[PDB]
């Protein structure tokens, strides 16, 4: 019946303000100086990156800005048919590896990153030692669409996602005191992922 579209107060406040300016989006876009060499930021669209079709390779690229406070939201656009076997979206410290040999959910694989595998609907963090957690929590009878929002609350130390205008709930906790960057892990040849910062709330 009626799906719930209620969202936490602060997210409502932020989303009530006008979207961030082009200059602000660019300030928080993919960093061409902090990427896997198998990936490159599109010359004609600094908000989108492209992955060379390298075999047995998992590649990542970080956003230009590391966040330490405030509520921040950004939109990720990842064509569904361009995800392959492992497509993870999340955040990480500046130390997270941007590349690995073979195909896997690199983001969320060590204690340096936190990610949501869009194909497995699972949350990963320190994956080597910790088991993944289903998300969103199943209750009925879930596919992640082409676009959705990521919400990092550094004041509370949480990461959450909003799909189809629906708040999916807190995915990770314990991020307080860190400096986190937006990050993605991909393995599909020629995939293009777009990240557009929506806004930050200093509340």
């Amino acid at each position: 019946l009626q799906a719930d579209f209620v969202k936490p107060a602060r997210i409502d406040i932020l989303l009530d303000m006008p979207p961030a300016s082009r200059d602000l989006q660019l300030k928080h876009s993919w960093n061409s100086e902090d990427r896997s060499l198998n990936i490159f930021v599109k010359e004609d669209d600094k908000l989108t990156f492209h992955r060379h079709p390298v075999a047995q390779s998992t590649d990542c690229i970080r956003g230009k800005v590391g966040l330490t406070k405030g509520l921040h939201i950004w939109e990720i656009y990842w064509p569904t048919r361009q995800r392959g076997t492992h497509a993870v979206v999340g955040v990480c410290t500046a130390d997270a590896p941007l590349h690995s040999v073979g195909y896997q959910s690199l983001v969320g694989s060590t204690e340096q990153s936190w990610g949501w595998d869009l194909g497995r609907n699972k949350l990963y963090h320190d994956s080597k030692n910790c088991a993944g957690v289903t998300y969103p929590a199943i209750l009925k009878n879930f596919l992640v669409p082409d676009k959705f929002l990521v919400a990092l609350d550094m004041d509370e130390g949480t990461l959450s996602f909003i799909v189809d205008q629906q708040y999916l709930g807190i995915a990770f906790r314990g991020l307080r005191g860190k400096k986190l960057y937006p990050i993605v892990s991909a393995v599909w040849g020629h995939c293009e992922i777009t990240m557009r910062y929506i806004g930050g709330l200093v509340d």
């Binding site: 896997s36 198998n38 060379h52 079709p53 390298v54 075999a55 590649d59 040849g189 020629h190």
Partner: peptide, 15 residues
């Protein structure tokens, strides 16, 4: 292959 990649491409990140 499965993830739409091919072995002809040079993996600059590995090298």
């Amino acid at each position: 292959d499965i993830n739409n990649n091919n072995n002809i491409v040079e993996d600059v990140e590995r090298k």
